[PDB]
Each structure stands twice: as C-alpha cells, then as structure tokens.
Amino acid sequence: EIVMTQSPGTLSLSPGERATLSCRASQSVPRNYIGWFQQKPGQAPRLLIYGASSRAAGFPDRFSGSGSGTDFTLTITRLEPEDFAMYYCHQYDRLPYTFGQGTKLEIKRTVAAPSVFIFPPSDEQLKSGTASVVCLLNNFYPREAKVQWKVDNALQSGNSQESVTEQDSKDSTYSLSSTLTLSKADYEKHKVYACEVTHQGLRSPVTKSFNRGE
Amino acid sequence: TDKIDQIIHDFIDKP
Amino acid sequence: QVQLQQWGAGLLKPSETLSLTCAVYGGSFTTTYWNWIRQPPGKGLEWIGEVNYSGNANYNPSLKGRVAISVDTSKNQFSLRLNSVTAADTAIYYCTSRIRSHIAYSWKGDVWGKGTTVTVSSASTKGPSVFPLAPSSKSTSGGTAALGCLVKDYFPEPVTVSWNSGALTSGVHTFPAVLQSSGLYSLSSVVTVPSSSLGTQTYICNVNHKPSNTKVDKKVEPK
C-alpha cells in the first residue's frame, strides 16, 4: 500500500496565473506508474496525464506533469476558467491501488462577507410535530465560515446539519445553509433563537435572531 | 498492434 | 474506438448483493486489464478491485472478503458482485481500465462509461414535504430580502426546484440534499429579492419529485 498525499489540498488562483499541484508517495514507485484525474462537480472524472510526463489525448499542452520516485507534480500553465476542478493523483504500479485525497482548485476572488438570514419554522410544519430553524449565509468568499446556533443564548451542538453550494460560476462566491432540528416540544420550550456567524470578511460575528410567536 | 498488445499484457501483470 | 457500456441495479436495500456489469466494445479482454472503482458522494476515489481475462482478481485489502468479481470473455463483459452491503457503501460505481502507460499499446490511455449511482437505503419511496421559509423578519428597507422553500423527508435523491417556474433564474440558490438520521433526504432552496418587491411581487417555488410522482407548488408571502 502506497499512501498518496496531495498538497496543498485547496488551491485558490486566478485566470492567468500558474498552478502547481503536488502528489507524494508513501513508498517508492518503481515503474513510475501515475495518473492525474480532472473531476468537475456532478461530472465524471477525466484522466488528464498518465505515467509521469505523458498527456492524455484531448487536452492542451498547458497541462504538464513531471517528477519521479517519491515525488510527482502537475503544472497548469496559463489557466483558463475551464480548468478549475478537483484533481486526483492515482498509482497503478504496485498493489493495492490507491488514490490521493484530492486537491481542490478554486477561483480566487476578493473577500466578501456573507449575507445572513434566519428563517423560523412555519406553523404548518409545527402541525407535523417537528420544528426546523434554517440559517442562510449567502454569497461569501472564501469557503470557510463558522455557524453557531444559540437557543435562549444556549450554544447548540450536534443537532444541526450544513450544506454548501459549489462556487458560483458568475460572481465566484459560495453559499451555505444550516438546519437546526428540534422537536415541537423543544421548540416551544424556548424563546430566543439566534444564528451566530463568523467569517473573515466580518470584523466580528453577526447574529440574526428571532423570538418565537412574533 | 493487437497481437503485440497481448504480449505487452504479459509483464504488466499485477505484482 | 473503445467504448464501455455499464448496466446494473442502482437502488438496493441493506444486506443485499450488488451485481453490476460492464461491457467492452472495440477491444479485447486479453489486451487490457479491467478494474472497478467507486466514488462515495463528495469524497475521495476508492479502488475496490481489478480483474484479468484469465479470471485472476485482486481486491482492495479492506473489502477482500465481501467482494468477488467475475469476468466472462464470451460476451466481452465483466461483472462485479458484492455481498452483505451496508449504507456505508453508498457511492457512484465506475467500471474502468487501468492505465496502459506504454509507448507500444494502442489507445495508450484509459476510458470508462458513465458511472452508475448506487444508493443503499432501507427507506422506500416517499413524497417530499414543502414548508415555506418566512420571507421577512422586520426586513431592512431598500435592502436584501430572503425567501425560501424547505423540502424535507423525501426519497429517492433526485429532486428539482425552480422559482416562478424557472422564470426567476437570478439570485437563486438551490442547495444540495442532506440525508438525515432517519435515512430520508432534506434539501432547501432560497432566493434573495428586493424588499420593495415583496408588496409588489408574488414568489412561488416549484418542487418536483419524479420517482414519487409528487409535484408541489408553494407560495411564500410575508405574514
């Protein structure tokens, strides 16, 4: 077994720049059997380079692999917007086969703070016996953001679930949705519900809250 | 090249 | 000119054998090795196994006992059989050929057909519940206002949401599905619109779920 370490694991660049992705092997690869896969969201992976330096048919010359032995590198020259995707490095030399954890190549933009909104549960939903309070972080960059739920100022943990959109193709931002799930009883036992957001575009956390029964 | 590709198939067997 | 045609059973209940098959047009089984890989949702690739025309099979060391792959050159097709599957095996299965990477070989790279999404779930088909998300809590005048629709407790995965029957394409965020503890999916869609439009405007979200033949349109208005 040869463990594959790709680095850095998230690559933020802009059109025109040069992209360098690294793939490192836990053990020596004798036959220099390696490949690189490009995978766009929702689309099947496409093999890009095979072996060390060999480029697969159908791709421009700006993609070039290099390296040997324990260390391999993939270089993308004059990257156009279509190149941004997730890239995996694979080794077919020695059993068992393994894939890299993957490197995410994203498009760099200026920092943008999220627009935060909190949505209480609908009364028709409360009729069903369950209450879900939703918090939206809209159009923010970079991807990293932290959502913290508070009920009557009590920190909530483990009862929430997050979902994130892929980076928008137009403004190059991200969006995130968080759902806090409680039973109707637990919902009725508390008054102030607050969603506290921390993001690098905001000096201090922004809290959007509501009072039950407004 | 097919007959050759069969012969290349010999040494690439899974180690 | 090689092309791979894959067919198999996508949906299965837990602890049921998974049998998938992949077909080879344009090239012999003896010329190239074949292998099966799986990609779980939003996770790294995993290689379950590999097969040779002679029947020799080498499997991932974790799953060796559970997986067995058999290949028949008679029909130029090879099949993956997996036993005692569990929800953790939910993934998209791809049948591929390992990279040739030699100057002598014809079509020196690899190609595979479109993967088959395999979902392991106990829950049967169910229709989504659509709950509206309040458009405004004392929303700021001359500022962004947020409307939403909440889809909950729906299986299988495919669902489509569009606002005003697709008439509203801008500022529309439809979020990926989330599988809850019960085993049913939960998804949400949200849109941002000018606060001035709320009094002027009507916003309806259309949720459509084909497997359950459940189509629900809802109207989101401030109360």
Whether the Cβ atoms of residue C112 and residue C24 lie closer than 8 Å to each other? no
C105 vs B5: CB contact, 8 Å cut-off? yes
Is C74 in a helix, a strand, or coil? helix
Chains that touch B (3 or more CB pairs under 8 A): A, C
Whether the Cβ atoms of residue A148 and residue A206 lie closer than 8 Å to each other? no
What are the DSSP E strand ranges found in A129-173?
130-140, 146-151, 154-156, 160-164
Is A175 in a helix, a strand, or coil? strand
Q: How far is A188 from A14, CA to CA, in rounded Å?
A: 49
Q: What proportions of chain B, in percent to the nearest 5, are helix, strand and coil?
A: 45, 0, 55
Give me the number of domains chain A comprises: 2
Domain identity same for C118 and C170? no
Residue-wise over C193-216: b if at least 16 C-beta within 10 A, else e? bebeebeeeebbbbbbbeebebee
How many angstroms separate the CA of residue B11 from the nearest CA in chain C? 12
C64 to chain A: which residues are within 8 Å by CB? none
Query: Chain A contact for B8, CB < 8 A?
Result: no
Whether the Cβ atoms of residue A192 and residue A153 lie closer than 8 Å to each other? yes
Written as six digits, the tokens of C69 are: 């792959």
Name A51's Cβ contacts closer than 8 Å, sequence gap at least 6. Answer: A32, A33, A34, A35, A65, C99, C101
Give me the number of domains chain C comprises: 2
Domain identity same for C43 and C98? yes
Q: A94: nearest CA in chain B?
A: B15
Whether the Cβ atoms of residue A102 and residue A11 lie closer than 8 Å to each other? no
Using CA atoms of C60, C66, C69, C70 in order, give the dihedral in degrees to the nearest 10.
Answer: 150
Domain identity same for C105 and C132? no
B15 to chain A: which residues are within 8 Å by CB? 94-95
Domain identity same for A88 and A124? no
Nearest CA-CA partner of A146 in A77, A200, A70, A84: A200
Helices (H), C46-126: none
User: End of a domain among C78, C107, C122?
Assistant: C122
DSSP A44-87: --EEEEETTTEEPTTS-TTEEEEEETTEEEEEE-S--GGG-SEE
Candidates C30, C50, C106; nearest CB to B1? C106
C52 vs B8: CB contact, 8 Å cut-off? no
Cα–Cα distances (Å) from A127 to A66, C52, C115, in that order, read 62, 59, 41
Domain identity same for A127 and A205? yes
Nearest CA-CA partner of A76 in A40, A36, A43: A36
Q: C133: nearest CA in chain A?
A: A119
Query: Chain C contact for B10, CB < 8 A?
Result: no
Written as six digits, the tokens of C100 are: 């040739």
Give the number of other CB atoms < 10 A from CB of residue C24.
Answer: 23
A161 vs C131: CB contact, 8 Å cut-off? no
Whether the Cβ atoms of residue C69 and residue C51 lie closer than 8 Å to each other? yes
First to last CA, chain B: 25
User: End of a domain among C87, C106, C122?
Assistant: C122
Q: How far is C188 from C152, CA to CA, in rounded Å?
A: 8
Q: Is C76 left (phi over 0), alpha (psi -120 to 50) or beta?
A: left
Nearest CA-CA partner of C117 in A167, A42, A165, A97: A42
User: End of a domain among C76, C94, C122?
Assistant: C122
Whether the Cβ atoms of residue A12 and residue A108 lie closer than 8 Å to each other? yes
Phi first, then psi: give them for residue C8, nearest 5 degrees: -175, 175
Q: Which secondary-structure segment (H or E) carries A180?
A: strand A174-183
A179 vs C188: CB contact, 8 Å cut-off? yes
Q: Which secondary-structure segment (H or E) carries A119?
A: strand A115-119
Query: Chain B contact for C25, CB < 8 A?
Result: no
Domain identity same for C53 and C147? no
Domain identity same for A139 and A198? yes
Q: C57: nearest CA in chain B?
A: B14
Whether the Cβ atoms of residue A116 and residue A206 lie closer than 8 Å to each other? yes
Written as six digits, the tokens of B3 are: 């007959």
Domain identity same for C167 and C211? yes
User: End of a domain among A109, A135, A153?
Assistant: A109
How many angstroms separate the CA of residue B13 from the nearest CA in chain C? 9
Whether the Cβ atoms of residue C101 and residue A50 lie closer than 8 Å to each other? yes
Domain hosting residue C71, numbered range: 1-122
Nearest CA-CA partner of A149 in A137, A138, A164, A133: A133
Q: Which residue type, as a one-letter code, is found at position C98? A: R
What's the resolution in A?
A: 3.7
Using CA atoms of A194, A198, A203, A205 in order, give the dihedral in degrees to the nearest 10.
Answer: 10
Whether the Cβ atoms of residue C80 and residue C93 lie closer than 8 Å to each other? yes
Query: Chain B contact for A95, CB < 8 A?
Result: yes
Q: How far is A148 from A174, CA to CA, in rounded Å?
A: 18
Domain hosting residue A53, numbered range: 1-109
Chains that touch A (3 or more CB pairs under 8 A): B, C
Whether the Cβ atoms of residue A22 and residue A6 lie closer than 8 Å to each other? yes
Domain identity same for C151 and C183? yes
CATH code of residue A147: 2.60.40.10
Cα–Cα distances (Å) from A19 to A84, A152, A155, B12, in that order, read 10, 47, 41, 33
**Looking at residue A96, what DSSP letter applies?**
S
Domain identity same for A49 and A138? no
**Looking at residue A112, what DSSP letter applies?**
B
Q: How far is A50 from A55, CA to CA, in rounded Å?
A: 6
Q: How far is A98 from C168, CA to CA, in rounded Å?
A: 44
CATH code of residue C201: 2.60.40.10
Give the number of other CB atoms < 10 A from CB of residue A211.
Answer: 12
Phi first, then psi: give them for residue C168, nearest 5 degrees: -100, 100
CA C153-C156-C161 angle, 5° bins:
70
Structure obtained using = X-ray
